[PDB]
Amino acid sequence: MQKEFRTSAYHSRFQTPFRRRQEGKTDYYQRKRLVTQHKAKYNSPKYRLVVRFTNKDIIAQIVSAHITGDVVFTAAYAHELPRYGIKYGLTNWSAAYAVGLLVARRALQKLGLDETYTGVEEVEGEFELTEAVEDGPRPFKVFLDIGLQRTTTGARVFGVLKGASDGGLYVPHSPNRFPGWDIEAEELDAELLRKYIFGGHVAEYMEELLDDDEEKYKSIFKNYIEEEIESEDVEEIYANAHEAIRADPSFKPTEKKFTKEQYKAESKKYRQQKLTRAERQAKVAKKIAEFK
Amino acid sequence: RKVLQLLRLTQINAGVFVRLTKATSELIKLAEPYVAYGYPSLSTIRQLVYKRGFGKVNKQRIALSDNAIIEANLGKFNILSIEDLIHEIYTVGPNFKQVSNFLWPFKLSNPNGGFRARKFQHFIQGGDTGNREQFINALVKQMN
Amino acid sequence: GKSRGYRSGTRYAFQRDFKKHGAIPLSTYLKVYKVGDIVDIKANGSIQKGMPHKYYHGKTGIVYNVTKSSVGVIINKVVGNRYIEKRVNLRVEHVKHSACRQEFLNRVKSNAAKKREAKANGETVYLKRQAAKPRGSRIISTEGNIPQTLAPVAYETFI
Amino acid sequence: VNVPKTRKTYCKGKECRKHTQHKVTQYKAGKASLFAQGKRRYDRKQSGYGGQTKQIFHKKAKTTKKVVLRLECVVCKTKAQLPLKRCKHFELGGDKKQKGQAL
RNA sequence: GAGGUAAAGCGAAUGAUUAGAAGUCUUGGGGUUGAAAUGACCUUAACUUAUUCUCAAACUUUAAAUAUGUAAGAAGUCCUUGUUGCUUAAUUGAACGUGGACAAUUGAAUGAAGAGCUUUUAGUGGGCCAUUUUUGGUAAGCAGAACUGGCGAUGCGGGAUGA
RNA sequence: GGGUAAACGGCGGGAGUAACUAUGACUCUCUUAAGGUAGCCAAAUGCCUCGUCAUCUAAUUAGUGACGCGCAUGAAUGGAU
RNA sequence: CCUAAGGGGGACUCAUGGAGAACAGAAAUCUCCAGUAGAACAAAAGGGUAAAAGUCCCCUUGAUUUUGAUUUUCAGUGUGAAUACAAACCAUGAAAGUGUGGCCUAUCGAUCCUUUAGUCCCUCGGAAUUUGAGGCUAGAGGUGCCAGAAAAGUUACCACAGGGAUAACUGGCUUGUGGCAGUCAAGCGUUCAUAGCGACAUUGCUUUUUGAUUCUUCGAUGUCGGCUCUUCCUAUCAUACCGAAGCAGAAUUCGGUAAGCGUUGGAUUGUUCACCCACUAAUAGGGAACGUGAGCUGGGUUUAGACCGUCGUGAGACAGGUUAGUUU
RNA sequence: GGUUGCGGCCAUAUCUAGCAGAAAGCACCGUUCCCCGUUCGAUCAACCGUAGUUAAGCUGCUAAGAGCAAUACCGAGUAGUGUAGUGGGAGACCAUACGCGAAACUAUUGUGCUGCAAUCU
Ligand SMILES: C[C@@H]1C[C@@H]([C@H](O)CC2CC(=O)NC(=O)C2)C(=O)[C@@H](C)C1
Numbered sequence A: 001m002q003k004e005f006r007t008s009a010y011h012s013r014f015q016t017p018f019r020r021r022q023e024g025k026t027d028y029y030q031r032k033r034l035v036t037q038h039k040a041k042y043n044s045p046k047y048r049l050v051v052r053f054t055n056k057d058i059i060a061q062i063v064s065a066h067i068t069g070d071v072v073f074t075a076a077y078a079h080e081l082p083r084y085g086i087k088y089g090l091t092n093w094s095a096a097y098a099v100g101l102l103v104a105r106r107a108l109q110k111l112g113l114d115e116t117y118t119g120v121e122e123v124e125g126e127f128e129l130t131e132a133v134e135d136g137p138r139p140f141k142v143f144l145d146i147g148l149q150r151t152t153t154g155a156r157v158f159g160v161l162k163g164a165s166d167g168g169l170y171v172p173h174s175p176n177r178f179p180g181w182d183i184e185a186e187e188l189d190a191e192l193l194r195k196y197i198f199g200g201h202v203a204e205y206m207e208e209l210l211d212d213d214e215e216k217y218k219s220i221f222k223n224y225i226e227e228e229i230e231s232e233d234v235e236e237i238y239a240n241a242h243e244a245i246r247a248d249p250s251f252k253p254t255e256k257k258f259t260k261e262q263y264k265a266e267s268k269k270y271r272q273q274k275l276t277r278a279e280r281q282a283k284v285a286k287k288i289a290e291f292k
Numbered sequence B: 001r002k003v004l005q006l007l008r009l010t011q012i013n014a015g016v017f018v019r020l021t022k023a024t025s026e027l028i029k030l031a032e033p034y035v036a037y038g039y040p041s042l043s044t045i046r047q048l049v050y051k052r053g054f055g056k057v058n059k060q061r062i063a064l065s066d067n068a069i070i071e072a073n074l075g076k077f078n079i080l081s082i083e084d085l086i087h088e089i090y091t092v093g094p095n096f097k098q099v100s101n102f103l104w105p106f107k108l109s110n111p112n113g114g115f116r117a118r119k120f121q122h123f124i125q126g127g128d129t130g131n132r133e134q135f136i137n138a139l140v141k142q143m144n
Numbered sequence C: 001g002k003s004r005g006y007r008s009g010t011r012y013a014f015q016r017d018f019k020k021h022g023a024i025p026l027s028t029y030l031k032v033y034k035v036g037d038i039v040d041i042k043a044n045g046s047i048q049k050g051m052p053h054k055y056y057h058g059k060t061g062i063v064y065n066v067t068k069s070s071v072g073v074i075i076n077k078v079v080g081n082r083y084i085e086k087r088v089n090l091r092v093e094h095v096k097h098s099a100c101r102q103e104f105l106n107r108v109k110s111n112a113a114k115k116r117e118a119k120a121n122g123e124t125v126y127l128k129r130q131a132a133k134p135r136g137s138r139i140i141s142t143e144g145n146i147p148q149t150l151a152p153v154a155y156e157t158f159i
Numbered sequence D: 001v002n003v004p005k006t007r008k009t010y011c012k013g014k015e016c017r018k019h020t021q022h023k024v025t026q027y028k029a030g031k032a033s034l035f036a037q038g039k040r041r042y043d044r045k046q047s048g049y050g051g052q053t054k055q056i057f058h059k060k061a062k063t064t065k066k067v068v069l070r071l072e073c074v075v076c077k078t079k080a081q082l083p084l085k086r087c088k089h090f091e092l093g094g095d096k097k098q099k100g101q102a103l
Numbered sequence E: 001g002a003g004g005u006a007a008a009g010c011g012a013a014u015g016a017u018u019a020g021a022a023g024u025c026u027u028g029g030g031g032u033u034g035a036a037a038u039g040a041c042c043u044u045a046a047c048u049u050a051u052u053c054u055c056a057a058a059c060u061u062u063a064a065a066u067a068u069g070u071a072a073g074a075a076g077u078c079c080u081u082g083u084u085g086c087u088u089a090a091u092u093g094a095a096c097g098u099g100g101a102c103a104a105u106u107g108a109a110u111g112a113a114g115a116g117c118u119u120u121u122a123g124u125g126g127g128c129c130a131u132u133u134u135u136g137g138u139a140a141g142c143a144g145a146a147c148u149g150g151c152g153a154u155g156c157g158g159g160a161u162g163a
Numbered sequence F: 001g002g003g004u005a006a007a008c009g010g011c012g013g014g015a016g017u018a019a020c021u022a023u024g025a026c027u028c029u030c031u032u033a034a035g036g037u038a039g040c041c042a043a044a045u046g047c048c049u050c051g052u053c054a055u056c057u058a059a060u061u062a063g064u065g066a067c068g069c070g071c072a073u074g075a076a077u078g079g080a081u
Numbered sequence G: 001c002c003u004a005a006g007g008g009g010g011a012c013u014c015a016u017g018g019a020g021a022a023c024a025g026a027a028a029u030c031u032c033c034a035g036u037a038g039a040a041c042a043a044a045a046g047g048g049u050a051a052a053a054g055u056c057c058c059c060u061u062g063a064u065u066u067u068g069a070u071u072u073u074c075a076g077u078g079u080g081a082a083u084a085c086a087a088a089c090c091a092u093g094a095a096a097g098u099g100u101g102g103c104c105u106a107u108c109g110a111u112c113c114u115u116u117a118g119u120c121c122c123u124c125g126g127a128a129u130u131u132g133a134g135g136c137u138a139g140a141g142g143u144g145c146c147a148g149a150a151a152a153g154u155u156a157c158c159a160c161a162g163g164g165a166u167a168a169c170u171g172g173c174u175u176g177u178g179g180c181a182g183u184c185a186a187g188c189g190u191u192c193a194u195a196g197c198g199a200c201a202u203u204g205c206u207u208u209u210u211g212a213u214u215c216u217u218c219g220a221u222g223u224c225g226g227c228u229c230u231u232c233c234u235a236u237c238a239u240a241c242c243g244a245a246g247c248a249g250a251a252u253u254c255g256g257u258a259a260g261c262g263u264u265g266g267a268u269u270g271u272u273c274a275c276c277c278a279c280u281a282a283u284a285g286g287g288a289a290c291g292u293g294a295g296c297u298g299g300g301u302u303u304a305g306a307c308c309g310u311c312g313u314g315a316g317a318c319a320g321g322u323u324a325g326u327u328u
Numbered sequence H: 001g002g003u004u005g006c007g008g009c010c011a012u013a014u015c016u017a018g019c020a021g022a023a024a025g026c027a028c029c030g031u032u033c034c035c036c037g038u039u040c041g042a043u044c045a046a047c048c049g050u051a052g053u054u055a056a057g058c059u060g061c062u063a064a065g066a067g068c069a070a071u072a073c074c075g076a077g078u079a080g081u082g083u084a085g086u087g088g089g090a091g092a093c094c095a096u097a098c099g100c101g102a103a104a105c106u107a108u109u110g111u112g113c114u115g116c117a118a119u120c121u
């Protein structure tokens, strides 16, 4: 009764969006605003702290843009944290803080800016920016890139932001998005931010649930139960993790049980292969012949 | 008009030698409705240079009445005689540009025997303009 | 009522290409322009700031100034019996590098590479480009290629 | 058009030289003085005989005047003048628009 | 490099448009079914599907020819390293340089009664015609444009005679 | 605010309606300062127009007598004799 | 036109269709699916725009200050508009960034004078003080004929300088319109396309209509009609000789060669034109500078007098009527 | 080679209908103390990675698939066009000479490639 819409004319004139826009992964408006560099700073690249949150992982990369494609400067993953003493809650706000601190220290060691720009040593929850040292190299400057993730006060991305800023990277920001910011009284509560930095919210949840709903405690905080980790000593886990990260931030790749060629050969087994033109011509001939 | 001025054809019945390349071929194509060109034989070149050969010496048209005149102006290009110049023209040599530019544009007379009935149409259609390819020699014999 | 506004007659010149509307690929914003570069001007309709006048659409010039988001291009325009240097400010979305440089810059390096070798080998080499010369003599063999005789065909109506 | 009663713009004052609060009000041209040299000159050229000695404009074409805003800085009392475009209607501090309401 | 005119296209968007065919009418009526069932049947009209004929100065995916921009070196390329309050995380750059190498094929053709620069002043500011492109008009030795060439300002040979 | 037109001057439209039709005494309607009265007229003033009828002639865009919604007649800008 | 319809940020996706839900139906609201923009973006049209430039929400005043550079129109002058920066000061955002009015292309204005703001500075010249005045920098008050005089008619009593750069005749180009002639053949014609006609179409000619144009003439080519007189054309009204018929005769109609020869007298009108009466073989049509004014006439038009109607406050107008008006 | 993150070119990558997917990753998935946001913890926020699943997303393959792209003894040296003639023709227009040269149509082929970092039976 109505005009069939998906006509050949509809397909012919359709302008497909950008590949990574149809994937729903890249916002090219924000990408244009971030990447584009002041033309009089000819080949000096802008550096993006790309922060991404999966269901199980945190990725924090430092990226500069080029025509052939983006080039990774340094990278830090949440699944690196077990090496530094954090095994559980790898997607906490505090795990995000640890990842940010790790990427900051790793990048600074790669550059050579370790003696200068050590960062906020005594994590207190105060808002503070990496201040340049007079008569010395300016701090590494990085701009946060949250992609399609929504900006809400208390979001985990700004945990990575805070960790990187405390690690010595100069990442410009305002403290009105940290958990602990009072909009009505426009100041940042340092104690609540400090609580969130050292897993205080997770510890409070364990305390509250343990003495109220113990079965949900057994199901949710199982890994802490088998680890004999109480609510009170969680803060020291993150405190030791911070010191360990600041002691040695270098990258240790995981030992791989197979070579690249072995992986390629193993994976190529489960891949269907395209037919020959002759094969599909034979298929068409067979179908016609069996149609009579 | 500009093309004809660059070929130094500034008067009627004026002749010049051109080395064929893509650039000069495209130049000549623009001037085709006004010129007759062809592939000259050796005897045609010799008769032209002997009877009507003049050199450009200090922007002056000087008759080639002695080999000293040719030498004084083309010795740095190893042209020591009228025969050297004719050979450089015929077998287009390394110094063709200098030798051909040294030659003043030849000033032929009207043909003895006339043209065809109507000139300003292509030689294929019974005119005289364009490329005639070996009949340039008969025309030059009429004209020199 | 004659109308001679700024963008008069740009109905097709300032249109986007078919199936090329929308956002600009970021290779445009990543290219680096230096003072003295040769660039082509092509107005992009989707960016109305820093847009050239319709005269400069399709003209080539020299970058002389580089600012935050723009370049200053120099164009020679015929005004009467002489040229006038025009200084146009263009956002880099309307500007592209001229490809005529690279082919010549390649020949500059290629010529030097060939020339220095000829000195090394104790010979000489001629570097000037040459127009396509008339072709030399050749022999056409006819094994399997006995000439086909073609004749004009009779007239025939084909409706 | 509608303009608010206040505005925070740049102040030219030597001790302000920054954005400060301003009280916006409309500009009214003052009355022509009788002792201005031009008036004082024109009143003698008109005396005696000769009639009307200067042009009197009649071919009016505009229907609107540019509205000038006289911005009073609240700190150093320095005035400023801002011209607007030509508008047939102009009020200061009117009712702000209500978007999404019925007729 | 740029272009959207000629051409082309319309079983490609917009708009215009000829003809049937097969379907849906369940959200068209008529007639005939029914003691009352909107549930059919014959019909025209609507739409839908695949086709079909013909178009567009102010339609278009495509898209010439001619005309048009730039480059084809010594004020160039390359190697090394000096200045800055600009720029970079930086010893990064950017701009301008010092010093060193690359000579007559110093980097396409052809031509050049030479190139460049300045002052000052005359007349003119009614134009017209031809080819080609083209608008209004039935048309015009009509009105108005585009490119070139002419007449005006020019005789001479031809068109008998004729800007 | 009053007076003054032998001061300058001005002096309207639309519908239906009478035991055929035609017309409209009549009615309704908008509107003016007032709505052209008595008279006169295709007049030296009427376009249409060589108006229609009669008379004058063999034949008359002429003449005269009538008729009259009169482009655009009319009362001391005097009307009719 | 807009304190948002400006600026920043965020979230969302539009027109429409389909399938469904009490009242509810073609149109209310709700839900899902499709939906490349077929919506919207103040106002013309064009361009542009989809995690937006569109819809909604939060915060705002960058629609701010200083003076330069550049683009368009261009003389590379002004005005308008726009662009990119510099030095400030701010808004917004986590931030990169963005913002010097409106997504872009239109939306506007010198000198003189006045006025306001700024600087509180310079001057009033014999020396001061205070009022007043005059300066310096930026706005506003306006010129739409928009590079910007302050401006009602009429001349039929007219003047001058000019103009064929320009109208009112002829002529010339054209032939729409006018006129005349073909081709085809659906029909008409008792049947019958074509004796005689001939629709719908289509091809021409003519310059006796009126146009269109403005080439010649404004240091003048005497511009209506009539009378008078000559000549020419043929597209032939009559007269000669013929062919055809829906030609029995008579009369008539169609056609050919034919311009030799003729084509009138009157009433009304200035008329050309027209319309009657009458005679006649017939009362055909045209040209010749719309033949013909040092041939006439002067009724008309179109000087100056005068009257009327309508129009105008008026002087006056009328391509309306009327009467009188030097023809070398 | 598979996968993830960030990309470059922006359909050879899109669209429709099917089928398959070991490891890992991604994902769907669970909960509401806390930060936060809603008519609604659906979206958004936080927490667990613990209870489950490859059903979907995602990836690959299939289709005389639509579309798109490329190529051509395809159409066609056609249409058109620059230049020329005291060429033809009443004209409208056309042919020829020296040059340049399409689009549709037809047919065939193809159906993302790739950079940086990490990870994996
Ligand atoms: C109409 C009014 C006056 C007008 C202006 O003063 C008229 C003057 C101009 C001039 O230079 N000389 C004169 O004699 C007349 C102006 O400027 C407007 C804004 C305001």
Ligand SMILES: [Zn+2]
Pocket: D011, D012, D013, D016, D017, D020, D073, D074, D075, D076, D077, D078
């Ligand atoms: Zn102040």
